[PDB]
RNA sequence: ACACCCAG
């Protein structure tokens, strides 16, 4: 832009309001023009960027006088509004995702990642026949897992109308049709949620997350779901402390059947003192645990 | 300079961009002016 | 205080509670040679 | 845009 030195980048002097090059100090161009608002409005709200770019339509307000009403007791000018059937689907899905996420009290950043995942899939258009609620509820599952805090399928299925089988199929098909790799869950990621819901203290939480990580690392129970070893970790940490919790209350939070938690407990039991940390205040002795 | 039929407008003059500029307000988001929104409704009804 | 002479009048002096107000001259001083201009008016902007 | 507020 500078005549003598065109290669140098222009530095901006907003205080002095002009374009100056930093070699010879010549002022190029004209006075800088602010692109922001002059007040501290004559502009409207921006289009939602994730919503597809439609039209800059306005709305018609309520009638104010006799000239705004027809003689059969109604307004002459009606608030007809254009919107694409694709934008109607995106809006109704986004309005379902915020409903879905706020039922389990997700933060807004998971919602924004879900809406990013929904818009990316919907424009790529590989999921033609599956219901919009099913694909949206699967995108909420992935965005929860991609932020390092995944959820149980039963936890998401409790909120949505969509069954576990259907969201499972939608979860498989989205990963295949997005070429997106997502990390495998562990037992430590399902520890803070499953322990605070049952009203257990921090030291009980630390004991539960230690015996769960030790069981996975030692590889004592192949092929069991991480839910079944997390609830077993809660069951030992609660039965070997003051705050006792029965299998019904633990399994209700975990969705794990009161069969499955015993099936998990019949093999993790006989090596109990190896799993516990060396600095745990044992309110209940290890040999005093019930033989379940 | 002013005929009576010229007051009954049949073509609507669209203002230039210097009359209705688009602002940038806390990030990359072009907030259009009220005239641009109103001229959007003019074209949509006229096309309809 | 300057010449050391007694002031002929007798000054009324004593402890009085005073407050300092947030209206401070460093928050109010403002000058502008040439600066940014508005997107619509091409006139100088509003306020320091 | 609105609130609050400075000076007369």
Question: What secondary structure, in 3-state letters, does A241-272 show?
Answer: CCCCCCHHHHHHHHCCCCCHHHHHHHHHCCCH
Residue A186 sits in the same domain as residue A238: yes
**Quick check: is A215 in a domain?**
yes
Same domain, A134 and A192: no
Domain-embedded: residue A75: no
Residues from chain A that touch C40, judged by Cβ atoms under 8 A, are: 38
A92 and A187 co-located in one domain:
no
Cβ burial A9-47 (10 Å sphere, 16+ → b, else e):
eeeeeeebbbbbbeeeeeeeeeebebeebeeeeebeeeb
Q: How far is the CA of A41 from the C1' of D2 (A)?
A: 11
Looking at the DSSP bridge assignments, the partners of residue A75 are A69
- List the alpha helices (DSSP H) in chain A: 85-103, 108-124, 132-146, 153-159, 164-178, 192-196, 202-218, 226-239, 247-254, 260-268, 272-275
Does residue A140 sit in the same domain as residue A191? no
Last residue of a domain, one of A181, A198, A218: A181
Same domain membership, residue A167 and residue A143: yes
In angstroms, rounded to a whole number, what is the distance separating the alpha carbons of residues C31 and B28?
Answer: 30
- Nearest CA to A240 out of A196, A286, A189 is that of A286
Q: Tell how strand A27-31 and strand A69-70 pair up.
A: unpaired
Is A46 part of a structural domain of the chain? no
List residues bridging with A11 in a β-sheet. Answer: A20
- d(CA A54, CA A83) in angstroms, rounded, equals 7
- Report yes or no on A236 lying in a domain: yes
Provide residues of C within 8 Å CB-CB of chain A.
33-42, 45-47
The C1' atom of D8 and the CA atom of A250 lie apart, in whole Å, by 73
How far apart are the C-alpha atoms of A139 and A146, rounded to whole Å?
Answer: 10
Q: What is the dihedral of CA A15, A17, A21, A23, to 10 degrees?
A: -50
A82: tokens are 């254009």
Paired tokens of A215: 């069981």
Which candidate, A239, A245, A230, places its Cα nearest to that of A282? A239
C-beta of residue A141 within 8 angstroms of C-beta of residue A153? yes
Domain match, A165 and A234 both: no
Domain count, chain A: 2
Query: In Å, how far from its chain's centre is CA A204?
Result: 27
| CA A49 to chain CA mean position, Å | 19
3-state SS, residue B7 = helix
d(CA A203, CA B8): 82
Check which CATH number belongs to the domain holding A96 and give it: 1.10.472.10
Closest CA to A53 of A113, A119, A126: A119
Residues 6+ apart with CB under 8 A from A60: A77, A78, A79
- The H or E element that residue A28 is part of is strand A27-31
Query: How far apart are the C-alpha atoms of A211 and A207, rounded to whole Å?
Result: 6
User: For residue A7, how many other CB atoms are within 10 A of its CB?
Assistant: 7
Q: How many CA atoms lie within 13 A of A279 on its CB side?
A: 2
Whether A18 is covered by a domain: the verdict is: no
Answer yes or no: is A43 CB < 7 A from strand D. Answer: no
Are A99 and A134 part of one and the same domain?
yes
* Longest pairwise C-alpha distance within chain A: 89
Partner-chain contact A34 C41, CB within 8 Å = no
Torsion angle, CA of A115/A117/A119/A123, rounded to 10 degrees?
Answer: -170
> Which residue, of A133, A155, A181, is where some domain finishes?
A181
- The whole-angstrom separation of Cα B36 and Cα B21 is 9
User: A232 in a domain, yes or no?
Assistant: yes
Contact assessment for residue A204 and residue A241, using Cβ atoms and an 8 Å cutoff:
yes
Would you state the structure tokens that stand for residue A209, as one six-digit string?
A: 């997350």
Round to the nearest angstrom and report the end-to-end CA distance of chain C.
40
Q: Between helices A226-239 and A247-254, what is the axis angle to 10°?
A: 150
Please check whether residues A245 and A284 belong to one and the same domain.
yes
3-state secondary structure of A287: helix
Longest dimension (CA), chain C: 65
Contact between A240 and A284 (Cβ < 8 Å)? yes
- The DSSP output letter for A33 is B
Q: Do A140 and A227 sit in the same domain of this protein?
A: no
Interatomic CA distance for residues A91 and A113, integer angstroms: 16
Which residues touch A140 (CB under 8 Å, ≥6 apart)?
A: A97, A100, A101, A106, A110, A114, A156
A237 by Cβ neighbours in 10 Å (0-12 / 13-18 / 19+) ranks as buried
Note the resolution in Å, 1 decimal: 3.1
Whether residue A198 contacts residue A177, with contact meaning beta carbons closer than 8 Å, is answered with no
Is residue A92 domain-resident? Answer: yes
In this complex, the residue with its CA at the shortest distance from the C1' of nucleotide D1 is A41
Coil, strand, or helix at residue C33? coil
* Closest of A177, A171, A176, A174 to residue A157, by C-alpha: A171
Do A147 and A120 fall into the same domain?
Answer: yes
Domain residues for A218? 182-289
| Contact in structure between A286 and A273 (CB atoms under 8 Å) | yes
| A204 and A157 assigned to the same domain | no
β-pair type (A11-13, A18-20): antiparallel
The answer to whether strand D lies under 7 Å from the CB of residue A44 is no
Distance from CA of C27 to the nearest CA of A (A): 17
Same domain, A200 and A156: no
Is the residue at A195 inside a domain? yes
Q: Given the structure tokens 């309001």, which residue do they identify?
A: A17
How many CB atoms within 10 Å of residue A278?
A: 5
**What approach was used to elucidate this structure?**
cryo-EM
Helix (H, G, I), strand (E, B) or coil at A96: helix
CB atoms within 10 A of CB C42: 11
Q: Which residues pair with B24 in a beta bridge?
A: B30
Report how far apart, in Å, the C-alpha atoms of A220 and of each of A87, A226, A234, A268, B48 are: 51, 13, 17, 7, 71
Of A137, A166, A181, which one is at a domain's C-terminal end?
Answer: A181
**Crossing angle of the two packed helices A164-178 and A108-124, in degrees rounded to 10:** 70
Instruction: Report the residue numbers after which chain B has a gap, meaning the C atom sits over 2.5 angstroms from the next written residue's N, or none.
Output: none
- Distance, CA of A265 to CA of A258 (rounded, Å): 11
């Amino acid at each position: 832009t500078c005549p003598n030195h065109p290669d140098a980048i222009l530095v901006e002097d907003y205080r002095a309001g002009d374009m100056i090059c930093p070699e010879c100090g010549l002022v190029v161009g004209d006075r800088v023009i602010d692109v922001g608002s002059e007040w501290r409005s004559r502009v409207g709200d921006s289009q939602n960027p994730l919503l597809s770019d439609g039209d800059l339509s306005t709305m018609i307000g309520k009638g104010t006088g006799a000239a705004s009403f027809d003689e059969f007791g109604n307004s002459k000018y009606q608030n007809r509004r254009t919107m694409s059937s694709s934008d109607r689907a995106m809006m109704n899905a986004f309005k379902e995702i915020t409903t879905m996420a706020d039922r389990i009290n997700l933060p807004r950043n998971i919602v924004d990642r879900t809406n990013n995942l929904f818009k990316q899939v919907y424009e790529q258009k590989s999921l033609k026949g599956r219901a919009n609620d099913a694909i949206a509820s699967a995108c909420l599952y992935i965005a929860c897992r991609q932020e390092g805090v995944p959820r149980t399928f039963k936890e998401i299925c409790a909120v949505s109308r969509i069954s576990k089988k259907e969201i499972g199929r939608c979860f498989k098909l989205i990963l295949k049709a997005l070429e997106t790799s997502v990390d495998l869950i562990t037992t430590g990621d399902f520890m803070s949620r499953f322990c605070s819901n049952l009203c257990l203290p921090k030291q009980v939480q630390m004991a539960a997350t230690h015996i769960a990580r030790k069981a996975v690392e030692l590889d004592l129970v192949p092929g069991r779901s991480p839910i079944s070893v997390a609830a077993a970790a809660i069951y030992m940490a609660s039965q070997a402390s003051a705050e006792k919790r029965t299998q019904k209350e633990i399994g209700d939070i975990a969705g794990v059947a009161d069969v499955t938690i015993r099936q998990s407990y019949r093999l993790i039991y006989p090596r109990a003192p190896d799993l516990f940390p060396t600095d745990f205040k044992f309110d209940t002795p290890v040999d005093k645990l019930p033989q379940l | 300079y002013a005929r009576p039929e010229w007051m009954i407008v049949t073509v609507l003059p669209v203002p230039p961009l210097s009359v209705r500029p688009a602002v940038v307000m806390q990030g990359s988001a072009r907030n259009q002016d009220d005239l641009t929104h109103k001229l959007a409704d003019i074209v949509k009804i006229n096309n309809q | 205080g300057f010449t050391g002479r007694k002031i002929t009048s007798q000054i009324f002096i004593g402890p009085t509670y005073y407050q300092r107000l947030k209206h401070m001259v460093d928050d109010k001083i403002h000058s502008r040679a040439r600066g940014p201009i508005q997107i619509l008016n091409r006139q100088p902007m509003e306020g320091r």
